[PDB]
Amino acid sequence: ACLEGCFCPPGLYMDERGDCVPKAQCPCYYDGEIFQPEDIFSDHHTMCYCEDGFMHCTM
Amino acid sequence: ACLEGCFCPPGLYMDERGDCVPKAQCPCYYDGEIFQPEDIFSDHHTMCYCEDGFMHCTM
Amino acid sequence: DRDAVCTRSVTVRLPGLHNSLVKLKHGAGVAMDGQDVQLPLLKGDLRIQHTVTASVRLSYGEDLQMDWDGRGRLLVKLSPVY
Amino acid sequence: SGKRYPPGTSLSRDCNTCICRNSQWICSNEECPGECLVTGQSHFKSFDNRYFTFSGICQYLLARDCQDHSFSIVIETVQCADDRDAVCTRSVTVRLPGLHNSLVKLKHGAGVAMDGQDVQLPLLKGDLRIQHTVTASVRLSYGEDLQMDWDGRGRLLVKLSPVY
């Protein structure tokens, strides 16, 4: 719905530590795993990184 | 041990929200339950409150 | 006062999954089977996540909701199947 | 180490103590806990204070109780940069046959997942305690004869008491 509470402006997204942050350093939660904003990351066979809050995997 | 990291001065104790606070509003975790700093609280038979971070129960 | 009786906690019981036992704690805390648990809690049916980051919300399937029993404002949502 | 000490003194290593008597340090030989370390990209340390590197990408067996089966640890390794010589840890899986034959997973955040379930810290079950250390690093503690360390960005450590 259109709920009521404490938000912060749309340029800012909520971080775990009570602050909210722009999406630049907004970590990724791939598999739940809290990847830092720049994490290059891959098996032999997959290839994955965290860009901006989204986790870009490939194969 | 004598560990290394981010602390805050001894007058301040760590709160869940990334800030650390004096012990006045430092909640209680009785049974795990996160009681606000002033919570009067009791069955018929027990009698319990949260003072300053400690939960004072009686009977 | 003797005329002041508020909620501490509520216990929920799902025979459909493990015959488990969920406990909603006077914080925003939850405890499943004695174990404290991070939010979100995607198990198969029931989802338990914060709402405003100051209030818990259980969601069993689609026919059930809950609300924060921290300071005792418990609510439910029962769909007309019941 | 190139410096003098009077006789009778008792300097102490981390493992035990040694005392100067007639220009000869006397020493105990009593055991003391070892540490297998993972860090960097692929730099390993043995219990017996070996160093090496093995940039393999698979679910390798880090450690295990091998005469009985009190536990077993399994690293999972991944390439970790554009370079082929950059293989860092993603996650580690721990397995406790002593409790439920459960399966703990340490996640590249500070996150943990037991049996697929994400879990708040602390996690007092009967034996194993899992809580943050600096609020930026997880620490498992099974009983008294076992520790762990954060496998978030891949700096896994252990503490095995001399019972093993």
Residue A56 corresponds to which amino acid?
A: H
Buried residues in A19-32 as b, exposed as e (16+ CB within 10 A) = eebeeeebbbbbeb
Buried residues in D107-139 as b, exposed as e (16+ CB within 10 A) = bbbbbbbbeeebbbbebebeebbbeeeeeeebb
Q: Do C52 and A6 touch (CB under 8 A)?
A: yes
Is the CB of C41 inside 8 Å of chain D's CB atoms? yes
Please give the residue of chain D at the shortest CA–CA distance from B32: D122
Within C1-82, strands assigned E span: 10-12, 22-24, 30-32, 35-36, 46-50, 56-60, 64-65, 77-78
What resolution (Å)?
4.4
Is the CB of D19 inside 8 Å of chain C's CB atoms? no
Rounded Cα gap, residues D43 and D73, in angstroms: 17
- Rounded to the nearest angstrom, the minimum Cα separation between C53 and chain A is 9
DSSP designation for A42 = B
Q: Do B6 and D133 touch (CB under 8 A)?
A: no
Q: What is the 3-state secondary structure (H, E, C) of chain D?
A: CCCCCCCCCEEECCCCEEEEECCEEEECCCCCCECCEEECCCEEECCCCCEEECCCCCCCEEEECCCCCCCEEEEEEEECCCCCCCEEEEEEEEECCCCCCCCEEECCCCCEEECCEECCCCCCCCCEEEEECCCCCEEEEECCCEECCCCCCCCCCCEECCCC
Comparing CB atoms, the residue among D111, D120, D125 nearest residue C37 is D120
- Rounded to the nearest angstrom, the minimum Cα separation between A3 and chain C is 9
Strand partners, D157: none
- Interface residues of A toward D, Cβ cutoff 8 Å, are 27, 29-36, 39-44, 46-48
Residue C14 corresponds to which amino acid?
A: L
B6 CB neighbours in chain D (<8 A) are 134-136
Strand partners, D18: D11, D27
Q: Do D120 and C43 touch (CB under 8 A)?
A: no
H or E segment to which residue A38 belongs = none
Q: Do D136 and B5 touch (CB under 8 A)?
A: yes
Using DSSP bridges, classify how beta strands D24-27 and D138-142 pair: parallel, antiparallel or unpaired: unpaired
Q: Determine if the peptide bond prior to D122 is cis (ω within 30°).
A: yes
Looking at chain C, the number of H-run helices and the number of E-run strands are 0, 8
Please give the residue of chain D at the shortest CA–CA distance from A44: D57
Rounded Cα gap, residues D56 and D88, in angstroms: 9
Residue D115: closest CA among D126, D103, D124: D103
Sheet holding B39-41, edge to edge: B39-41, B47-50, B55-58
D79 C-beta neighbours (distance < 10 Å), count: 23
How far is CA C39 from its chain centroid?
Answer: 12
Rounded Cα gap, residues D66 and D138, in angstroms: 26
Please give the residue of chain A at the shortest CA–CA distance from C42: A32
Rounded Cα gap, residues B40 and B7, in angstroms: 31
Rounded Cα gap, residues D59 and D105, in angstroms: 13
Helix (H, G, I), strand (E, B) or coil at A35: strand
Comparing CB atoms, the residue among C29, C36, C43 nearest residue D123 is C36
Please give the residue of chain D at the shortest CA–CA distance from C40: D118
Residue B44 corresponds to which amino acid?
A: H
Angle among Cα A39, D109, A22 to the nearest 5 degrees reads 65
Residue C32: closest CA among D99, C46, D110, C69: C46
Longest dimension (CA), chain A: 47
Rounded Cα gap, residues D8 and D25, in angstroms: 9
- Interface residues of C toward A, Cβ cutoff 8 Å, are 51-54
How far is CA D111 from its chain centroid?
Answer: 17
- Rounded to the nearest angstrom, the minimum Cα separation between D91 and chain A is 9
Please give the residue of chain B at the shortest CA–CA distance from C26: B33
> After which residues does chain D become discontinuous at a C–N distance over 2.5 Å?
none
Rounded Cα gap, residues D94 and C7, in angstroms: 39
- Interface residues of B toward D, Cβ cutoff 8 Å, are 3, 5-6, 14
Most C CBs within 10 Å, among D102, D106, D118, to test the C interface: D118
Q: In the numeric block, which tokens belong to residue D97?
A: 């046959």
